[model samples]
Target: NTIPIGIALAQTSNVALLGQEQVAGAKIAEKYFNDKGGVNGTPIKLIFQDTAGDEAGTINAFQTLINKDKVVGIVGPTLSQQAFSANPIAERAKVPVVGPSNTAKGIPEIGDYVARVSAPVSVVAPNSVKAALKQNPNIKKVAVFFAQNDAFSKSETEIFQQTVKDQGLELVTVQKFQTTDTDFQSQATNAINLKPDLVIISGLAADGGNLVRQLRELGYQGAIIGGNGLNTSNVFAVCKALCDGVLIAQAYSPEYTGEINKAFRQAYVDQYKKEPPQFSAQAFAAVQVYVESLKALDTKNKVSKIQLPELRTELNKQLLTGKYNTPLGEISFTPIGEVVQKDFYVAQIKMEKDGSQGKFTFLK
Candidate 1:
């Protein structure tokens, strides 16, 4: 017997750097669980649909998965804006959706069928600000930059800007950019000229990494902080040597000592020859929740015997009530679908001297 799960994420477009990692992690989870006798001997089949990094694409993917692919549930629409657009579809259809990396403010409230493995921006964005201050106590003025076009960056930047004020630091300049922009010289120059001792950025991998490189290239010698968007290793390729010393808030840490985490990390490195990033870990955890929840639901009531619509509803109920020891560590969901996670981390990117490699080193 085979159960179907939908995976709708960006397989093409600028967002692929992040989505690719999520794909890798999800694939590992598919094989890992199946090898261990998937869902108590009933193997699962993953149906993949590319969201193409846009709201319309995400909606199309969700629609197809729900109507045509006939998947019992979905884990996807990588960006928060896409989540806002597509999650409602799953909600209306009564298909449970587990957002692997959607961490905007109102994601969980979308519907009872909507949930996420990623921690909210409000909780994950402020950690790096505190970490930055701890490393440089004399930090006074802060310049904040964000990709206003993206929902998560917009939400995350608000928290970052407020934390700047809360820490009694002057918010010198708040520069905004588009996620699609490659050249950040204007914003970088404007902030650099403000002479802020700490520069904070909230944008996706390509743009955020480009901004970091451009900032460093423009002679901004001060410390740099990045939001969760730049928390992937893919960013290292964008900024290269300049990625070093950029502090980032994290929802997943590679150093997590959970049994599943060790296996996930080992599997990731074995395949990619590198450490797993936050997005990857989060994606894997989302799949883990689905598998474990399905198993629980099956134990209570024969999942295959139930109709698809009723099965989806029961699965959603089971998912929220189950606690999973995941790669993100032990995690459960609130009634509203927000993740109740136990740990969060702030890490600094430590790049190789040649700028060819880097890692997220946990900042104690």
Candidate 2:
């Protein structure tokens, strides 16, 4: 019998922007691995469930995948907020759950059974602050904003705040908003009123992008640094004209020169006709880790339904000890089960002359 791998992704709700891409990326990796001959020649079957962008939905999704679907290992529940609620279920079940995009601080504390391919906010946010200060030396006063509902957003905002304080920059105003918020005029107005030299936004694409657009339209423009949520190319689509000169940090980029990255990027573009982002790359890396671990277990060509405890232990050991050349560049797990890879980059959005086209230019 083939081993079943479950994917719990956010198909609906505010996180859909990056969640959908994660699903696509994992599926592509599934295809690639199976095409290369699945673990010890046993086909790999994928079971998918939509987490719907809520804590309850995520918890339910994990329960269903573990109990009803009877999957061996699980991937996703995209956001760190979802992982906070959903990861416990898998931990209780003693099932291995790999997080493709849960970057909040203390995620590894959820349980020993939970592991993440995504780097924590601490690692990604400081780079953005450094990049901002490097680009504009005269920047002093700064304004910050974040979605109150998102754990990742909230955690990242804290890091940004610390970064600002560490750099001796004045924090003018710190604003908060909900994920569903559409009108950012009030927040933007207050932030602009502070007359800050820079604005740091930590939220999802929908609200974050809208905030960026409104900030520009309101005529406050020294520099904008968006947190992980506004790190996507889609942000450029949302705030086209205003997105220019905005800086954001990322974990992966197609421009990264690596065998695994090249293969995954080409496959993604060939299938979806678009460039894959850091979210997609992380998802792909999760699948790679799973498949590679299985290969290590089935080395003798002896195949059977893997014992859950034995498999989980071996998988974690292999991940930490072995280096994986994955789509997100070379990745190896740390002793704490966190991903260890220095493949982060900072990029600025550049709008075209007509203000209709935009490009993301990577910064050193």
Candidate 3:
């Protein structure tokens, strides 16, 4: 029998820019693992359910996957906001969920059934702040911006601001934007007038990209640190030439020299024609964890013989116990389901001179 795993992600809306990359990465895992003989010679099928960037849609997706599709495990609900709403359903249903990108505080703490491959805001956010300070030691004043409507961005900004203060810099200003807001003129101009030597942003692609563009156009020539929300290459499309010089910390780096990283990076480049972003890599890792864990469970007992509830329970136990060498580097899970990842990177956006394309250049 072919094992089934559900993939719940935003396939539409502004968030799709990041989710689409995740979809690509999960699909690559489907092929890669199947080619390697999936789940102890039984092929695995990924059931896709579009969460579409909202809490309601995510709940619906999780419900359908759990009740109708009968998947043994699940792999998403991209946003942390969605995770907050939908994870309880899975926890109640006793289905294991590996979050591909949900990185807000208190996610894994949501329930015993929930965990994530993505590093939390607390761990990933500070590295970029420290990196920015290193790039310019003279940086003193800091301005912070975040999409208040996004759970992860809001959580991330708190960490960013705390890091700024921890680094002994003055928090000159704090600006807020909605994820749907297109115009950031008021915020940009207001922050610029303060002459902040550094700026930090925590928002999803479209709004964050537009803000990045407008800040440069408004003559704010300062070091900018984009939060995890702005990690996707899709931001390059919105900011274009103006995207040059933005810094972002990474949970996944294509340059990672691990065997799995090389394979994943090559596979991503072969299909997408560009380096895989963190969302994609994390999604791939989530799937890999599931596939490997299912294999381990099957080795202990015939998985096909187990009932759905028992299978999910056993899979969850196995997943948390196993260590995986994924594209993100060798990673495992804590007892509470938070990821224990070995490596992280800080990278700067390097847009082409013509402004038509860009790539994340890793920082030293």
Which candidate gets the maximum lDDT versus the true structure?
3
Cα distance off (Å), candidate 2, residue 122: 0.6
Off by over 4 Å in 2: 300-320, 353-356
Per-residue alpha-carbon lDDT of candidate 3 for residues 1-364, written as tens digits (9 for 90 to 100): 6999999999998889889999999999999999999999999999999999899999999999999999998999889989999999999999999999999999999999999999999999999999988889999999999999999999999999999989999999999999999999999999999999999999999999999999999999999999998998899999999999899999988888999999999998998898888999999999999999999999999998999999999999999999999999999999989999877889999999999988899986
The TM-scores of all predictions, comma-separated, are 0.98, 0.94, 0.99
Worst 10 residues of 1 by lDDT: 227-236
Error of 2 at 114 (Å): 0.7
RMSD of each: 1.0, 1.8, 0.8
**1 against 3, candidate with superior lDDT:** 3
User: What would the TM-score be for candidate 1 when compared with the true structure?
Assistant: 0.98
Give per-candidate clash totals.
Answer: 0, 0, 0
1-364 per-residue lDDT for model 2 (tens digits): 6778889998888688878788888888989899988887887888999899799999988989888987878898788988988898888877888899889998878887788899889988888888999988999999999999889999999999999999999999999999889899999999999899999999998889899999999999789999888767677677888788988888887888898788899999898676787788889889888888878767833437556666655655565566789878888877767889886888888888666777768896
* TM-score of candidate 2 to 2 decimals: 0.94
Arrange candidates by lDDT, highest first: which order? Answer: 3, 1, 2
Runs of candidate 3 with Cα error greater than 4 angstroms are none
- Across 1-364, the per-residue lDDT of candidate 1 in tens digits comes to 6999999999999888889989988999999999999998999988999999799999999999999999999999899989998899999999999999998899999999999999998898888899999999999999999998999999999999989999999999999999999998888898988999999998998999999999989999999998877878889888899999999888887888988899999999998887898888888888999999999999999998999999999999999999999999899999999999978889899999999988888887
Clashing residue pairs in candidate 1 (N, C-alpha, C atoms within 3 angstroms): none
Error of 3 at 97 (Å): 0.6
Model 1: residue 261 alpha-carbon error in angstroms: 1.3
